[PDB]
Amino acid sequence: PTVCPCCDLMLILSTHLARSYHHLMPLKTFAEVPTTEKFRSEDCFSCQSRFPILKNHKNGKLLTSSRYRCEDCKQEFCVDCDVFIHEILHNCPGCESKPV
Amino acid sequence: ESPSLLTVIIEIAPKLWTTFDEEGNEKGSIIKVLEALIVFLNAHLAFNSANKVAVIAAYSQGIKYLYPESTSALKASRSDLKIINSDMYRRFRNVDETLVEEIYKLFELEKKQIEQNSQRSTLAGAMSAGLTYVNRISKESVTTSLKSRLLVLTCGSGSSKDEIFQYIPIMNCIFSATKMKCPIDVVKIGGSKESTFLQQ
Amino acid sequence: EARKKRTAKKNITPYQRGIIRSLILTLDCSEAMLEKDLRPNRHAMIIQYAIDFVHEFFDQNPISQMGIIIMRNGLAQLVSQVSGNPQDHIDALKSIRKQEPKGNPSLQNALEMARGLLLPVPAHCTREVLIVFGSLSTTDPGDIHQTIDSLVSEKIRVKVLGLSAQVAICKELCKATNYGDESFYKILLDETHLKELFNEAVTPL
Amino acid sequence: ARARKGALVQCDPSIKALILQIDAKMSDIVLEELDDTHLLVNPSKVEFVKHELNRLLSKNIYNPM
Amino acid sequence: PADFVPDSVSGMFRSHDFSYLRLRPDHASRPLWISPSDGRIILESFSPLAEQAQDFLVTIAEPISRPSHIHEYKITAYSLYAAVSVGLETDDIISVLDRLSKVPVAESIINFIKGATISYGKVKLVIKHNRYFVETTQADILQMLLNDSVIGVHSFEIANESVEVVKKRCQEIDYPVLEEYDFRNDHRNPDLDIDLKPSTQIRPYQEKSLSKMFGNGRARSGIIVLPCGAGKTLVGITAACTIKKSVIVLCTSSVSVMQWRQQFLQWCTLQPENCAVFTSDNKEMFQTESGLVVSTYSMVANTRNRSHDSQKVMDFLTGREWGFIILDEVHVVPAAMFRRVVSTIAAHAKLGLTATLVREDDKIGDLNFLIGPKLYEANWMELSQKGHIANVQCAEVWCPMTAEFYQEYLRETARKRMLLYIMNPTKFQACQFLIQYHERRGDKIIVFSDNVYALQEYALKMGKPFIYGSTPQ
Amino acid sequence: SLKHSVTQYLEEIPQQVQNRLYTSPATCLAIYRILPPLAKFFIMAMVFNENEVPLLDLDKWVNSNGKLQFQNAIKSMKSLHLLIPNKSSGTLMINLNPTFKISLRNALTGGEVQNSFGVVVEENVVSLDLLDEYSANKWETILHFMVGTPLAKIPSEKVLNLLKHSKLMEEVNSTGEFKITNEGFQFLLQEINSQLWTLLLQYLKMIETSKMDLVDVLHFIFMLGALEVGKAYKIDALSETQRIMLQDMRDYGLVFQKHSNDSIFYPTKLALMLTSDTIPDGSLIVETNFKIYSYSNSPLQIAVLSLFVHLKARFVNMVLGQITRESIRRALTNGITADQIIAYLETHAHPQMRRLAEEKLEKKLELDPNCKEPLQVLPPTVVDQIRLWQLELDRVITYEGSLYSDFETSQEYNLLSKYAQDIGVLLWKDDKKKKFFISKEGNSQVLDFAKR
């Protein structure tokens, strides 16, 4: 994007406009799921990687499970998708798969 | 040279495909699109031994992975139905069978839940899921230097107009795919010649 | 520790941020950048991190404009005018990477030329100055509180990424230019923290 | 315009002097002295030249135990 | 063997296949491999716990070589004597080796450690009223030795000359001699007020060498190897200041005697009235009850008919009981009669300082019986990368001889052969090119050649000055 | 390399043999996967249309910066006879090979394949504990006998006379033993996929008998490439030459069978990794005192180390060795050249040596940025000592032939010398000495020239 040198008008593109919509409305952070809460799925939503047993110690069981529930669509995500949806992407696949 | 992950975001909407069938002379064009996609995915797997395929279907009430199937179903299962012949190449044949069984399961599920009509298309969410899968496989890197490519098989059929609410997610998908150097291919099977968002 | 980091990121709120920005990247290029406490030296890695910052800033804020000023030999030196083309700023930073840093820094001269550069900026476009300050003291030709008052009157927000320690004139300048907010004066800890600061500097304020 | 049996060999002047002196020891090695760099050793004794040349240069090599 | 069958590739290991040692699960952290055949220790320095094992291994072992990544150490009887001198016993040496080693420590290695460390400090050589006694804490140790009886709480006096014979015999037997000086508790010898000047700094490797010498609070006789310019003279001054007794320093030249006297008078608080020099020109002695004398090996061991005043000085040196001797360039001590300077001078502590601890005969190992064990070796690469010594680029320049010189080299005897390979024109050309190149680079160049005729011919050919033996001072 | 070698063999195969080879879909699939990416893209863009395709369309498909790769793909396909040019109506039109097109389309879509991918009987054995163990045991046996360690078990006489009729594995009966050659050590240098391919290519070269049918042989090889590990296949779909070569590949270790003359066979992991590939073992440390510390527990890598390293001690992780003069001369008299010794040392150099070399290169670039130097992972002192030992082996090189001299006339000697120079067998000439020399193979031409 540059200002027009002949009529002093700013010349941008739609992608240049859209690069800042995530700064205008950001994604709410994904919530850490409770260990005792009933788990909806064994695999990620947009990634379908396994959520493993994650037994930190002998009696840990499902302590600090790698699911990251979204506040709106209530869909669980892995740690890689949790980083990726909040950093590189800027939109929730569960929130868009929700048929409002 | 280098293997790639081909992720096919296919928009199988019963409303859109019914309007496409009513506009055209033929019926059941979903079968023709699906079998052309099957042959194309077999072609991509024939291109290189180590390359990979993912398929995500964007139906009316959300998205669902077609290949590979859900790991819960992998743990629970295997009722190998005989839609695809078993005498063909097995490395293509498991892919094709998983794809067609997930197509059958998705159509049975939305036949069960057929009564609810939604105006919210899930193509943008399916493309976001495909981009997350691309990132997942690239970060896992079990095969070194894996490229990636999105192919979007959508249908307009002259019934659904341009949707304003899809503008922001598709733009974010553009930026993420440009960051990961993953091209996004779009095939629009319909009557409306112009689809500005997917063209961009 | 992961939960503490998540707690530190829980404070999410859709704050209104100025998208169209006019950033003045001011870089210290005096004798204090000859110190070898950072690898390979302060001047070279600040120039390299500024090149990465230019690329990231024009990737995430395309519409924004930016100019580059350095502090050398008691004077502020313009090395590229305020423009929306990142390639000119990349070329200017590459040109300054060769030259040897020497002199005494002048925060007042840097801020005066930053004020001059941000004067023709329109009112809708936010006015920001990011100063990578390497020294601990500055030699000014006149009063610097008058320059700070002029910056506040001209609505120019100054963020300073210091290198060695906390300087009170930089802290007071950041506080006055950011309306009592003392979180806009940042001092690095390691190379990773300096990279994190340059990555934080690309988001709209 | 006559024909003989012989084998050409490339050498520096040090090996040239070594093969000339081993010819002086046993005269059935080189057919004629040719140049400072090329000689004509006997094809039936090429391997003997190899073995005794390595043995005679082994005194110039320090071999730790 | 641990019920382990040989593998297919056990053939070319001549009973060195140590694969029977079961590997420990945490072997990645441990940096040590223990060879049961010869006590070799393989250390990896890139792994963690690297220096924490390296100090332990330089304490208990002698390093064969110390390259960048993998170091080699040898379990040696003298090194274990040094370890038990500085205070490490069998239990914690074996425990630390077991914890730091990947493979378990073998029973042969454990038994070798037990046998080497045991029977230490039983036989001792003490000097009482300028007379050598050998003393045992246990009564039966006197009576068990009966082969080499040179007799003249339980102790007996041995002859002055037979000290080395007694030490060699007790090294052959499993009862090594303990030679340590307790200069705190030795009050019969007169003390010195010698001390280091406050402006003198001591480098950390010199500190490590002096800590090896004075580890247990007693002065232990032995050898310190440091490169030239690393401060072996300063280590000698500091050892003299630590002992604070009468010091005699034996050097190889009169200019070295002058240098050592100047270094004492410069670095430490020793008075010139307390310092003396025994040379050809200087033969007057210090009149105080204790002090410093610096002399030469040839003057001390001159079996020729020496002068009357020098005989008086030798009588003074022999009649005094000396507390400390510094043998500079100790590699010449194992010579024919430079050996007897450690016998004719009855010194409580003996420190041999050198840079070149090699000889071309097998008599270099006699220094363990003459002076003592190898107390410290400097790592020359570590000193170079710390900048204490210069970083040298060692090169070997191959000069191909001409045909005529090689023919003449073949048809001559060895004495002419030496001069004939030295005097080849290719080395002239290479040396002249290197002289020109480094003179353009601005380097001070020394061209060493033992052949005097070759030295003169090269110097006259290149226009550079030459110094040899017959040149005036 | 690998793709280049199999492409060269398939190009050396004649045209009608290629057309017969393109019958089975699995062979067509493997041959397609050998091709470069532009060739593969054009092949798949041209399979699904039965009509004609010009070269101008394919040339317009390629960008301006990929014309060299387009020419490479066109020449590769033309040499492999996947393209038939036609000269009608002034445009050089292109057909895909019809048999290749039909077989590839059948392989893609599914249909008639005449059991080119085999049949599965659903009863299986464990892959890692039995199949991989058997294949690894056969491969370790073949490479241990090949490198020459003492073995209680030796491989089959079929691969014995394969190895003595191959270029590598020289052999004498005066001593009664085998020697590793230059290409023999090169074979150990490359990856085992290309090792299996070059063994299979030399086996393809040496099979000239009527008992072997070459198209069926390649069908079996590419079928084994197409198959999967860990599940079973029937022999009943094979011809008799494929049966006996199934026995031969059982001897090699490419395939496992529970008993000889069984109806059911099991392909192994080498069958799949035949197609394409996918601290480490064998990583070694070199020091300036020529000490080698090799973190190797595998007897194969210890044995390969023993070809040029004087081994001193062995532990579970690592082996002690020393690069000595007599060991390097042993390798050099076995023909293992210094360049490939140094290549082995580089490819098995340790990550710690890698990072110390990176630190040295970083200091060198921060001190003298004007000149750039290659990454010396291993000490140049030991590299130069290896090359100096090579030079001290090769101080003198001998050629045998004839020298013609004692010429009274210089013109005749000049005529003979220029004749030798023209026929290209001369090595030296001079009029001052009146002497010119020729090689033994070039003796006969000059002899008949002088006689006639």
Ligand SMILES: [Zn+2]
């Ligand atoms: Zn995920």
Ligand SMILES: [Zn+2]
């Ligand atoms: Zn959501």
